[PDB]
């Protein structure tokens, strides 16, 4: 039977960035064609692989990792980026093999008093690694004196707010992003085209 | 007892080059997003560049590879590398907690250092 | 990529008087990506206001901003000689963005 693309894709709620969604998926086979075909799509980048060759290839496993960003950060979701969403919140290889697949999704995630369910870590010591997922609350000391805890001066609560309204210009309106990555090990293949 | 004290300012002949410092008390710079901003004789304020707490910077079209932020965490203090400086780059320079974003103000800021490029 | 334009460019108003220093911006600009910086002459930027209509730490209660989408305001009731000062907005989309200021004349 074919590989649950529907279950990411057509979800009615997606996850903040921070805590981004990840959906293994194995022992399927995977119609991309259709998969490309559905909804419309604002974003719709590959590396390594071509998206019309996915229906010839075998993986071990493929991933699907789903969130939501603004309109402005959407390029950050690609191989050799930086800003505070590749930084702190979701993070690509620099050799990525996949796809990274985006659209408006202002209808859905943006509320007339603002959306702001969704969130994104905004303080952090270090950069993250590639395809690493940080749901740390922990208040964020940005000085010589410990926080114990307590949200104050130099002493941070990590995360932001997006707050979507659907009035807002692109930039700033919800983009709901699906990276597919495909993980090829020495190891039979369990997803195939 | 939250201070930015700036340096390095002065005059600097067209394309030398020149560095400025930012020693900080009262945060650490190697953990916070850390900017610099210019503003010419008469005019308007321009930011330039910053640091993310994580290393990663990023530079307005203007000074973009010309300039190179830069920090020292023993020393507790942020830098800023201008090469190849023009008339236009004469103006006073702040250095400024935060990036100007939600959450992320620029808060503090330094008394600034003017430079000046003149033959 | 959302342009930001200042206006007045300059306002002359006695003391006492209250003073309207308006934002506008191309786009629809969100409330909390908003800030207000003062300048005194001879002086650094001082935070006034950020997210729009949250006043800074320490700055008196005449001091107010509000407004949302295309237009942003920050009000000065009870005009003080001390408030002479240049008035910049400030915003955030790919990069840090500043309005031209505003400069602010006392009369007397």
């Known amino acids: 039977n074919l590989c649950p693309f529907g279950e990411v894709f057509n979800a009615t709620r997606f996850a903040s960035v921070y805590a981004w969604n990840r959906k293994r998926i194995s022992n399927c086979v995977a119609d991309y064609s259709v998969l490309y075909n559905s909804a419309s799509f604002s974003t719709f980048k590959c590396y390594g692989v071509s998206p019309t060759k996915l229906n010839d290839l075998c993986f071990t496993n493929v991933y699907a990792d789903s969130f939501v960003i603004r309109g402005d950060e959407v390029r950050q979701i690609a191989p050799g980026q930086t800003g505070n969403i590749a930084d702190y919140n979701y993070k690509l290889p620099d050799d990525f093999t996949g796809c990274v697949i985006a659209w408006n999704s202002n209808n859905l995630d943006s509320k007339v008093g603002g959306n702001y369910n969704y969130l994104y870590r905004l303080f952090r010591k270090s950069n993250l690694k590639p395809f690493e997922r940080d749901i740390s609350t922990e208040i964020y000391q940005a000085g010589s004196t410990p926080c114990n805890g307590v949200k104050g001066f130099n002493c941070y609560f990590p995360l932001q707010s997006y707050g979507f309204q659907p009035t807002y210009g692109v930039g700033y309106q919800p983009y709901r992003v699906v990276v597919l990555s495909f993980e090829l090990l020495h190891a039979p293949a369990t997803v195939c085209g | 007892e939250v201070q930015l004290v700036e340096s390095g300012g002065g005059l600097i002949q067209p394309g030398g080059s020149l560095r400025l410092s930012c020693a900080a008390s009262?945060?650490?710079?190697?953990?916070?997003?850390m900017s610099w901003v210019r503003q010419a004789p008469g005019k308007g304020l321009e930011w330039v560049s910053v640091?993310?707490?994580?290393?990663?910077?990023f530079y307005a079209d203007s000074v973009k590879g010309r300039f190179t932020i830069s920090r020292d965490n023993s020393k507790n203090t942020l830098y800023l590398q201008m090469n190849s400086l023009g008339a236009e780059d004469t103006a006073v320079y702040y250095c400024?907690?935060?990036?100007?974003?939600?959450?992320?103000?620029?808060?503090?800021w330094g008394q600034g250092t003017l430079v000046t490029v003149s033959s | 990529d959302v342009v930001m334009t200042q206006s007045p460019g300059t306002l002359s108003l006695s003391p006492g008087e209250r003073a309207t220093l308006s934002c506008r911006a191309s786009?629809?600009?969100?409330?909390?990506?908003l800030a207000w910086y003062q300048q005194k002459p001879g002086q650094a930027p001082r935070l006034l206001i950020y997210?729009?209509?949250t006043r800074a730490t320490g700055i008196p209660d005449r001091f107010s901003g509000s407004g949302s989408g295309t237009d942003f305001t920050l009000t000065i009731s009870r005009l003080e000689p001390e408030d002479f000062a240049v008035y910049y907005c400030?915003?955030?989309?790919?990069?840090?963005?500043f309005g031209g200021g505003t400069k602010v004349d006392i009369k007397r």
């Open positions: 400024a907690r935060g990036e100007g974003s939600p959450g992320n103000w620029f808060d503090p």
């Open positions: 009262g945060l650490t710079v190697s953990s916070n997003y």
């Open positions: 400030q915003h955030y989309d790919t990069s840090p963005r």
């Open positions: 997210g729009a209509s």
């Open positions: 786009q629809s600009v969100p409330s909390s990506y």
């Open positions: 640091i993310y707490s994580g290393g990663s910077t």
